[PDB]
Amino acid sequence: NSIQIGGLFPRGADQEYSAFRVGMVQFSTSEFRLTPHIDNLEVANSFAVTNAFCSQFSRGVYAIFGFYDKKSVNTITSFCGTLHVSFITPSFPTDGTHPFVIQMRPDLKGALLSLIEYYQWDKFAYLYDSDRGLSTLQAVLDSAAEKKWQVTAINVGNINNDKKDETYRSLFQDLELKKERRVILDCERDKVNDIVDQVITIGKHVKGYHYIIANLGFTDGDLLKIQFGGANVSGFQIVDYDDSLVSKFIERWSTLEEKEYPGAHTATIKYTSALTYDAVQVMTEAFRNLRKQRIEISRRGNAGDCLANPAVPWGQGVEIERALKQVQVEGLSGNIKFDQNGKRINYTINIMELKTNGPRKIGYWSEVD
Amino acid sequence: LLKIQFGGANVSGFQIVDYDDSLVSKFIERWSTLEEKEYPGAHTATIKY
Amino acid sequence: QAQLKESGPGLVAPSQSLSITCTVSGFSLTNYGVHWVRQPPGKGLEWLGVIWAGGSTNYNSALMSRVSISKDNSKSQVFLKMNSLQTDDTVMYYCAREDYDYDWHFDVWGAGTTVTVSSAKTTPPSVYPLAPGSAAQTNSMVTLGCLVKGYFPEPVTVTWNSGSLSSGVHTFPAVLQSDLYTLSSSVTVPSSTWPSETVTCNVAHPASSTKVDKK
Amino acid sequence: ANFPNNIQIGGLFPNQQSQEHAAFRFALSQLTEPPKLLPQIDIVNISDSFEMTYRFCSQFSKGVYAIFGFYERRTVNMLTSFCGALHVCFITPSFPVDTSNQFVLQLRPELQEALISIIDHYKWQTFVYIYDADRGLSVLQRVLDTAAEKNWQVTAVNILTTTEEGYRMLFQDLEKKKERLVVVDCESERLNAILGQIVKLEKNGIGYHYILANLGFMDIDLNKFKESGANVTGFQLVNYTDTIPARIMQQWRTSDARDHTRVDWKRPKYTSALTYDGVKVMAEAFQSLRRQRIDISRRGNAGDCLANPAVPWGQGIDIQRALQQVRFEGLTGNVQFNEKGRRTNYTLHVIEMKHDGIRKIGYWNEDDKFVPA
Amino acid sequence: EIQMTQTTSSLSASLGDRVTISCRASQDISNYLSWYQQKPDGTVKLLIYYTSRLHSGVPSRFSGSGSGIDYSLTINNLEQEDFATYFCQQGNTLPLTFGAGTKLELKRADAAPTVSIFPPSSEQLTSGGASVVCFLNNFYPKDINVKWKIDGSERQNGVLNSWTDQDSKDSTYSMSSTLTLTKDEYERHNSYTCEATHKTSTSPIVKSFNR
Ligand SMILES: *[C@@H]1O[C@H](CO)[C@@H](O[C@@H]2O[C@H](CO)[C@@H](O)[C@H](O)[C@H]2NC(C)=O)[C@H](O)[C@H]1NC(C)=O
Ligand SMILES: *[C@@H]1O[C@H](CO)[C@@H](O[C@@H]2O[C@H](CO)[C@@H](O)[C@H](O)[C@H]2NC(C)=O)[C@H](O)[C@H]1NC(C)=O
Ligand SMILES: *[C@@H]1O[C@H](CO)[C@@H](O[C@@H]2O[C@H](CO)[C@@H](O)[C@H](O)[C@H]2NC(C)=O)[C@H](O)[C@H]1NC(C)=O
Ligand SMILES: *[C@@H]1O[C@H](CO)[C@@H](O)[C@H](O)[C@H]1NC(C)=O
Ligand SMILES: *[C@@H]1O[C@H](CO)[C@@H](O)[C@H](O)[C@H]1NC(C)=O
Ligand SMILES: *[C@@H]1O[C@H](CO)[C@@H](O)[C@H](O)[C@H]1NC(C)=O
């Protein structure tokens, strides 16, 4: 059997695509055969995303594995909910409920607020960015207004790259003017590195400060520079390297060559590529469960236009979504099981702290506890 | 020095070749323009003593 | 570098099983799958079956009743055991390792080992001299002929002057006649040295491994 | 053959019968100068990216020169991208987005700077900001940064996330102190709906100061805020008592007396004025393009919407430059856009209500942060 | 099963030329085709993946194109290493079918075959049957017909035609054949000739032997 899917990868996601290839070649079974059509594009441009989605719907794909940015969430979600085409996305979970979007990144607002309450913080700064939406910002603001905190929220997204040092220095001077010893960084692996370099330049990594890296990847960034600074920093970690599955994967991942698999010759692994591996596993398991129950999901090449009127959804889309949401497996990110809305439930986030000898796990946050 | 400059601590040192003089300035004006292919290390504003 | 060394028997009795092995070096047999192909003489290869990395195997609908791939991940080996190998079923069996980079490609393909399942018994190759019947050398190099007969199994490797003088030696491919290798060769030996030093064609059977030299 | 007599203009209106639609049709009926604008109005759910994309593509396939319509939070990121990638201008009276290209023309003036100027003129230190998550997120970030830089205590609460018990809790927690300072960022209709609950906790009127972040202060009712010691302060963009606004309104009233519109203009809002000004902007731009003999023609018929590679429009840049260069004195005051397409060179009359006394404190500008009176 | 069938069975072109081998499938392969190269020694390797992109480390001269059923691989500037078979596979559904492909050869000067015949040794005289080996070397192209005339009477029976591969340096497809008759007839025959009709020289050249 041939089950055609589609792949929407951003311009620059090399390690993610390498992990996708590793998962495709590793999880292949005999019940079917995935034939993904890859289409690298710019996810932040809604026009290119619409063009790629229509191009891949013109082939009659079954699902579409792809990323999206805050400027393209609505296009992807609306097209998927209207045309009845699933969408496995390792990006941030959309705000609210959205059918036919099988999100893969576990939530962080709960664990973030739990860590804030654990450290018993009352006044702190919160440097955020509008890349992954403004859900965490609103959650933090509401929790602070309910628990009477002093949050100093600052958008560091408009920092231009030509004179970033001056703006960062002025920002940290203004933060010191209010005596802000606690800072929560909510950025990706690049803005976090930039802010860390600026902190080191301005000399604030000395003992007496505390930072919280608000992202599922702690060891992804450059931590060998703040480790010996004196200040204690904490963060979250979805993919732990102490498990047996992650260890067996890394033992066969660091040995790969960077020429064939770009970004593979490394000991660590970004959590987005781990979610990509798990997404390949989840699609394979869903197709196996559909083929085991003898569900004839074979659709002819009558896909036709992409923006037809009226947009008629095929009768097998809801079946594929139901089979994809009812998949419970164990992967690199941990236990994978989705609720009715597609969001991830029953996960586990390993909270880490950067000691002088390295990051050490101090506990695990869940949703039931 | 662009790394300790914004650290906060004050550091001091010595300097034999000053760039405020007229001779050093006239030399540097004809030294930073040289190509690093022919004269290695020349395409720089400063100069080791 | 991942490489599959297809090692097989090379010959087997008619209507008897044939088991070949492939030891993939550099690629874990538990992470990447293997696929077996059969290329006949001068024809396109046909995929017989594949043993996926997960352990599940899928074979072709034609050779399903005959092919059966079995993998040993500890020894890092994949064995193909095809029973009832007919004379027409004797083809170059090769093994390859599929990959995935924007399309399902077979990246590392093994060299493959030739298998000729034939019930021909080991017979000593008979090399006969094929005199041209001309005293005046029509060519600057004497085109000494050499025929083969009663050579089993096919083909009878023929080398002029026991492999020493092989200049202009056109050794045509043998045609399996009566379970024998009827090879023909024309060696362009030195016509000026004839017959003080003639290139005695040594013919050896591919199974008997017995070389006989005929002038 | 530079510019034809009939210029096709597209429109994306959310409702079939609204005041803004009647204003659009009337403004198009009032201009009698070549080239005549022929409208193609489509009723579209502005919250559906698929439906809006389908309408945009169906209009661009018809060979439309300019599209005039509204958008929402879930459609701006698509509309700006499509307009910037297809070189098609989009004149919109909706809420301005902080990030956009030069092809989308915002008709609504900015309000974050005027809000910060008002807060500074009043010198508020600790207050509550009731933000609407539908649109008022670009202003909340600016206000939070200004508060962090000026050492303020801005507690931010949402309308949707909070509930009736949440409303009571936030109101009583604000009532713990003596002074109550509220600044709300909601649309006209949403503010009218929320005022029904706001009136339940304001009849005491002990130190309540509300700042309405709307260009339609005159549109909101004054009965609920009255009978209470609450001082409200809101901006106002339209001035229906001046010469040009009153003349335009009198012409519209005579027209509506003779030939009715679709739906009357009861309780006139400001989006109607923005729509009238947008129609006038399109008319002026196309007049300026035709009078300069610039060749405007759609040679390639049935131009596809989604085609790779995307071949941008031929005469799109000239049309965009002419639409941006338009400057005149319409209904909302002075209509003139800057390089980014946003509105500049405008005046926002700050109006304060207390003891049912409508008093104009002053006006706002870009050169002067505030001008009292 | 998608039976990917190549267009041309065999092609021949000298160096410095650009060839283009095309293939067509039964059903839509969804542009998931792959062109590989098989040398004479048996070494195979990938040349173009996904029917659009060349493999890693392949020569930049070879490229591919064609979407849908038809797909063609074109070599920019031929050379000596480029003379090998080129096959095509369609990895869109199982069983993955491959195409027989065409082998590009070096075009040489159109020459005539040299008819040559050998006699039967006494061993084949006393064994019970003779054999006349007709070695028509220096033939171009390999397309040639054989007529074996024992005792003049052209008897195609016992004409076991088995040619040889075209040598690179020789640039001529050597032709070999065998003609048969009984030792009581061949030794009693009149003339055992073997005419080889080629494409360059339409006239047949027979290499007889007195019997
Ligand atoms: C980590 O850095 C912070 C500096 O803010 C400090 O942590 C305070 O330590 C006390 C106990 O010593 C905890 O109860 C607080 O939760 C910590 N965080 C605060 C007050 O923000 C301390 O200097 C460092 N070490 C630890 C163990 O927290
Ligand atoms: C316009 O489109 C929006 C977006 O699809 C519609 O909002 C949805 O409304 C349904 C009604 O039950 C809800 O179930 C969905 O959850 C809503 N979408 C989202 C993203 O929350 C809206 O109803 C449409 N309006 C009209 C008049 O059709
Ligand atoms: C808006 O820009 C224009 C020109 O840049 C200026 O306003 C002009 O306003 C003056 C005063 O009423 C009048 O001469 C005309 O209405 C305009 N002048 C021209 C030459 O067109 C002014 O700089 C800006 N502000 C206002 C309020 O108009
Ligand atoms: C969550 O996953 C664990 C791991 O197997 C399982 O034991 C538990 O029952 C799960 N709980 C729910 C509510 O699914
Ligand atoms: C409202 O205005 C009146 C008179 O202008 C003033 O006395 C009162 O203090 C104001 N209210 C507040 C809360 O400042
Ligand atoms: C608005 O209209 C009123 C009524 O005539 C007038 O007094 C006022 O000056 C106008 N606003 C401005 C800014 O001129």
Side-chain angles (χ1 to χ4, degrees), chain A residues 1-3 5-10 12-30 32 34-41 43-69 72-88 90-104 106-108 110-116 118-122 124-131 133-145 149-162 165 167-168 170-172 174-176 180-187 190-238 240-247 249-250 253-258 261-269 271-286 288-290 295 297-298 301-315 317-321 323-324 327-336 338-339 341-342 344-354 356-359 362-367 369, chain B residues 1-16 18-25 27-28 31-36 39-47 49, chain C residues 2 8-10 13-14 26 33 40-42 44 49 53-55 62 96 110-112 120 124-125 129 131-133 135-136 145 150 153 155 163 168 173-174 190 195 204 206-207, chain D residues 1 4-98 100-101 103-133 135-184 186-205 207-221 223-225 227-237 239-240 242 245-263 265 268 270-297 300 302-310 312-314 316-317 319-326 328-338 340-366 370-373, chain E residues 13 16 25 40 42 57 59 64 66 68 84 91 95 99-101 109 111-113 119-120 128-130 141 152 158 196 204:
Chain A
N1 295 115
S2 198
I3 298 182
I5 80 174
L8 267 59
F9 291 80
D14 47 4
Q15 188 176 18
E16 288 86 356
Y17 185 54
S18 62
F20 184 82
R21 299 160 51 186
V22 175
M24 279 287 307
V25 83
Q26 156 69 81
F27 290 112
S28 70
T29 80
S30 90
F32 68 109
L34 279 193
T35 58
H37 303 94
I38 315 296
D39 204 307
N40 292 33
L41 59 106
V43 287
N45 187 18
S46 200
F47 180 73
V49 169
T50 302
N51 233 341
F53 200 106
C54 285
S55 153
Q56 286 188 2
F57 182 81
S58 288
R59 296 182 235 195
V61 297
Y62 280 55
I64 297 186
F65 168 88
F67 303 70
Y68 49 63
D69 199 7
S72 55
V73 177
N74 312 283
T75 310
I76 279 298
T77 52
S78 282
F79 268 99
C80 288
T82 309
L83 306 166
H84 277 7
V85 161
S86 313
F87 192 87
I88 304 102
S91 278
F92 61 96
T94 79
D95 302 5
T97 179
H98 284 104
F100 301 90
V101 174
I102 311 305
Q103 292 143 10
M104 275 272 172
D107 269 297
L108 200 67
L112 182 59
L113 298 181
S114 221
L115 181 62
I116 295 176
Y118 168 78
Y119 283 149
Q120 272 141 40
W121 282 12
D122 203 78
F124 51 89
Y126 178 71
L127 311 184
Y128 69 97
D129 192 11
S130 42
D131 49 60
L134 292 176
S135 305
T136 301
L137 172 67
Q138 291 170 5
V140 162
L141 253 54
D142 292 350
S143 159
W149 284 336
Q150 280 80 6
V151 283
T152 295
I154 290 141
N155 182 21
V156 301
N158 288 153
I159 298 304
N160 38 54
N161 206 275
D162 62 346
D165 303 88
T167 77
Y168 274 131
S170 49
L171 169 63
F172 279 103
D174 293 358
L175 257 60
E176 184 46 47
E180 293 282 347
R181 296 294 165 269
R182 305 163 183 84
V183 174
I184 298 186
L185 307 172
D186 180 86
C187 320
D190 302 308
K191 216 79 170 186
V192 157
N193 286 330
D194 302 349
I195 293 180
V196 152
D197 292 348
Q198 291 297 328
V199 161
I200 293 182
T201 291
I202 207 56
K204 284 189 180 304
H205 57 109
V206 64
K207 177 58 191 63
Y209 296 81
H210 202 89
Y211 299 103
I212 294 183
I213 325 291
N215 66 334
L216 285 175
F218 192 55
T219 74
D220 296 3
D222 263 348
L223 299 178
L224 256 294
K225 34 179 55 184
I226 313 283
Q227 178 172 347
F228 305 103
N232 41 328
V233 304
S234 318
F236 312 89
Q237 177 91 355
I238 175 63
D240 63 326
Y241 306 98
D242 315 320
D243 193 276
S244 89
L245 186 49
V246 185
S247 158
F249 172 74
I250 288 295
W253 165 266
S254 1
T255 78
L256 301 175
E257 54 276 81
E258 201 159 346
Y261 299 95
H265 216 64
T266 317
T268 81
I269 165 177
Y271 68 101
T272 48
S273 81
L275 293 176
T276 303
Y277 190 76
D278 292 354
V280 181
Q281 182 170 7
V282 154
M283 302 185 72
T284 303
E285 174 71 20
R288 273 174 44 205
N289 282 343
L290 271 179
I295 315 302
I297 57 180
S298 305
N302 45 292
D305 208 354
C306 167
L307 299 158
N309 186 209
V312 287
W314 60 328
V318 64
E319 203 144 9
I320 296 175
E321 191 242 358
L324 260 160
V327 160
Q328 188 159 13
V329 292
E330 286 264 342
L332 301 186
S333 50
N335 186 36
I336 292 178
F338 312 100
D339 68 335
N341 280 330
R344 282 203 57 182
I345 70 177
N346 199 15
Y347 53 88
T348 311
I349 298 181
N350 312 10
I351 303 101
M352 319 272 283
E353 289 189 353
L354 178 55
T356 42
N357 63 68
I362 78 175
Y364 71 98
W365 186 94
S366 164
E367 49 169 346
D369 313 330
Chain B
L1 299 178
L2 256 294
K3 34 179 55 184
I4 313 283
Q5 178 172 347
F6 305 103
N10 41 328
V11 304
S12 318
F14 312 90
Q15 177 91 355
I16 175 63
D18 63 326
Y19 306 98
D20 315 320
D21 193 276
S22 89
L23 186 49
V24 185
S25 158
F27 172 74
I28 288 295
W31 165 266
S32 1
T33 78
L34 301 175
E35 54 276 81
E36 201 159 346
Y39 299 95
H43 216 65
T44 317
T46 81
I47 165 177
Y49 68 101
Chain D
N5 317 136
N6 308 349
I7 285 295
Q8 268 65 27
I9 298 304
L12 297 172
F13 285 95
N15 301 339
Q16 219 287 330
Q17 39 173 354
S18 283
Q19 178 191 1
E20 294 83 329
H21 191 292
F24 177 84
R25 211 222 68 181
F26 163 65
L28 269 184
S29 154
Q30 207 169 14
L31 53 100
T32 79
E33 310 93 299
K36 182 178 185 177
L37 299 184
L38 263 297
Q40 303 168 358
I41 303 172
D42 300 356
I43 312 303
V44 64
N45 180 13
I46 58 187
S47 288
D48 210 9
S49 284
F50 177 75
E51 183 74 11
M52 289 278 308
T53 290
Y54 164 55
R55 285 308 181 177
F56 194 99
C57 283
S58 158
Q59 286 184 4
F60 178 78
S61 157
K62 289 182 183 179
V64 163
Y65 303 91
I67 300 182
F68 171 84
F70 304 77
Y71 56 69
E72 213 209 5
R73 167 175 39 91
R74 295 184 279 258
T75 326
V76 44
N77 298 281
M78 185 268 296
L79 268 185
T80 63
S81 303
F82 259 53
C83 293
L86 281 184
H87 279 45
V88 181
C89 209
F90 186 63
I91 301 100
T92 170
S94 202
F95 189 70
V97 56
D98 55 352
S100 90
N101 47 48
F103 279 92
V104 50
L105 304 187
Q106 323 274 6
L107 280 167
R108 183 168 302 181
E110 301 261 1
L111 212 55
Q112 37 195 295
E113 286 305 275
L115 185 69
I116 295 175
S117 188
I118 284 297
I119 293 184
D120 263 8
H121 174 274
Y122 276 42
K123 265 310 306 182
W124 287 15
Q125 172 64 29
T126 297
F127 57 91
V128 68
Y129 192 105
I130 308 185
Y131 67 94
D132 208 47
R135 61 144 199 82
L137 279 181
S138 317
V139 178
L140 182 59
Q141 308 157 18
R142 181 68 178 97
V143 168
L144 285 180
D145 299 2
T146 305
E149 185 269 357
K150 284 173 176 293
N151 196 348
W152 288 347
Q153 310 302 136
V154 175
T155 191
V157 303
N158 198 342
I159 283 284
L160 311 95
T161 78
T162 205
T163 175
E164 296 327 280
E165 186 39 76
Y167 279 120
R168 288 138 181 78
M169 270 284 324
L170 62 87
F171 266 108
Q172 67 206 16
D173 293 10
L174 172 64
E175 283 180 349
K176 298 328 181 205
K177 312 145 293 304
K178 175 45 203 63
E179 193 83 302
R180 294 89 198 258
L181 303 177
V182 178
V183 46
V184 287
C186 275
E187 308 108 47
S188 87
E189 282 90 82
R190 287 297 291 179
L191 198 41
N192 275 331
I194 296 301
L195 230 57
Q197 200 273 339
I198 298 314
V199 81
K200 303 306 182 301
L201 260 301
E202 74 145 329
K203 299 317 287 174
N204 51 334
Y208 286 98
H209 208 300
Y210 294 89
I211 294 190
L212 320 166
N214 303 68
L215 301 176
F217 177 81
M218 280 296 186
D219 316 337
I220 324 168
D221 59 51
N223 62 68
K224 275 185 285 296
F225 265 133
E227 307 80 58
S228 165
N231 311 30
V232 308
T233 301
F235 315 92
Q236 193 75 33
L237 180 57
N239 202 1
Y240 303 101
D242 298 328
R247 196 181 74 260
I248 294 177
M249 290 288 300
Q250 170 177 338
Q251 294 160 8
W252 167 89
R253 176 48 59 113
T254 299
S255 158
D256 195 17
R258 46 175 169 95
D259 46 271
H260 270 258
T261 64
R262 215 141 295 107
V263 163
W265 289 7
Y270 67 107
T271 47
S272 190
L274 293 185
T275 291
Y276 190 100
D277 285 335
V279 178
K280 288 295 296 183
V281 151
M282 287 193 297
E284 292 289 334
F286 278 107
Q287 286 178 21
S288 164
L289 280 177
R290 182 214 59 88
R291 90 151 179 254
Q292 289 182 358
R293 292 157 295 277
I294 291 186
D295 213 38
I296 294 178
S297 308
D304 184 28
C305 189
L306 306 167
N308 38 69
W313 210 18
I317 309 180
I319 295 185
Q320 188 265 346
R321 266 138 51 181
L323 272 154
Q324 182 229 341
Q325 222 71 27
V326 162
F328 66 99
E329 192 78 12
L331 186 41
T332 43
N334 189 22
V335 178
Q336 176 180 356
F337 317 102
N338 73 83
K340 302 176 181 181
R342 320 201 192 192
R343 274 277 294 269
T344 328
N345 195 343
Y346 55 91
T347 79
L348 306 171
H349 325 328
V350 185
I351 295 189
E352 187 179 26
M353 196 272 286
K354 169 56 179 183
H355 288 152
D356 267 27
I358 297 310
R359 291 185 291 103
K360 170 190 175 188
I361 301 180
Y363 67 93
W364 202 86
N365 219 19
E366 306 92 320
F370 186 87
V371 188

